[PDB]
Design a protein around this ligand. Structure first.
Ligand SMILES: Cc1cc(C(=O)Nc2cc(Br)c(O)c(Br)c2)cc(C)c1O
Ligand SMILES: Cc1cc(C(=O)Nc2cc(Br)c(O)c(Br)c2)cc(C)c1O
Lengths: 114, 114, 115, 115
């Protein structure tokens, strides 16, 4: 039910081998590790979770943009990019978190479908 | 070699049934019709052209954003969204033109791969 | 009543010396030259037109992004970024057309205010 | 040395009365409250800090986008937009953090200048 896709606005390419960490907000308001991985050659990260595990709640997707840029020899502004949202069972069932990266900027959108 | 993908930033969805026209710049600097279609349920428009037909040159992709917004009952700013670029055989072979739409704004990127 | 602002997403800076050409659709459906200029050190382009001259119509703001990037020695994707909109059709408004540029991407937004 | 500007991509207007909370990472690795405020009628938030107080560090600018959209009666996707960056590590700079908001999307950029 959750996919992350990352694109590079400088090279016009997927953002490959980018580390992505997902956290779930705990009762005590701390961020608990939930899922992680690295984007593929297509810039996508599949298989993070299952429907059974992905219950309603607040999640944070942290994209390691700083390492990505440094590995390309580029000095970036941000420490990481964070996307924080609530999963809601009354809306559609599949979430795509998409990010478009530049050294000093990023854009993100949600594509939520059934 | 050419795919167009359109997303909706208001609803968090693909932008479905959006008209897209592609033009090729002619010798006399006019825009000649090249390919067209409507985005699918996934927001994508496949099959516009073939490798044989898609020669180097300047192309314009015009996305009919005004009709899209009006069909959803929303008053938009732009007449359309235009993406104008040169196809170059020395770069990678497949072009994805991606657009992310809002009533008063849009973002576009190119994903160019082999 | 028309201002253009351009930022650079690679540099984290205003986009300086960006050429901008504005056209207005004529009665015969062609794009007539309306005004032009370049962004300043702040990334802003002021003084394009006047409230008398900026009548109702369909306008095209062409931001010369390729020329900008090439002048910086970079080979970008797009030829230009075009922003096409109907203006002043409910009376005079003030328009800011804002753009944010990367070599293979851009975003644009409008800020429309009623004086 | 720190300014936040927020625009609304649905309205084509400044995003007014947007709450913004700034944190700075402490020695113990927690996020310490640093400053806060709200955007004005222009969409800008000035006066958050001073050059004395805005020392080197890792800062988090939290823009309360959900609260903004809910106050407008809209159910948005994100909880907030967070912008996290190292500041002043090569001496004092001026930072503008700019954001452009839609219910299911946002973009952010930085303008960094050397006074
Ligand atoms: C935040 C953002 C994402 C995207 C985006 O990720 N598009 C996109 C989404 C999926 Br799913 C795809 O498979 C592809 Br290809 C592009 C495009 C733009 C112009 C943008 O500003
Ligand atoms: C993240 C973003 C910011 C902006 C933006 O905020 N531009 C801007 C910055 C400052 Br300081 C201004 O005074 C004004 Br007007 C616009 C524009 C776009 C198209 C965009 O994607």
């Amino acid at each position: 039910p959750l996919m992350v896709k990352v694109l590079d606005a400088v090279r016009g390419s997927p953002a490959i081998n980018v580390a992505v960490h997902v956290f779930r907000k705990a009762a005590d308001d701390t961020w608990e590790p939930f899922a992680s991985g690295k984007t593929s050659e297509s810039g996508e990260l599949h298989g993070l979770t299952t429907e059974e595990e992905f219950v309603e709640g607040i999640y944070k997707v942290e994209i390691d943009t700083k390492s990505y840029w440094k590995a390309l020899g580029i000095s970036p502004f941000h420490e990481h990019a964070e996307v924080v949202f609530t999963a809601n069972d009354s809306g559609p069932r599949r979430y795509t978190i998409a990010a478009l990266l530049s050294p000093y900027s990023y854009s993100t959108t949600a594509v939520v479908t059934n």
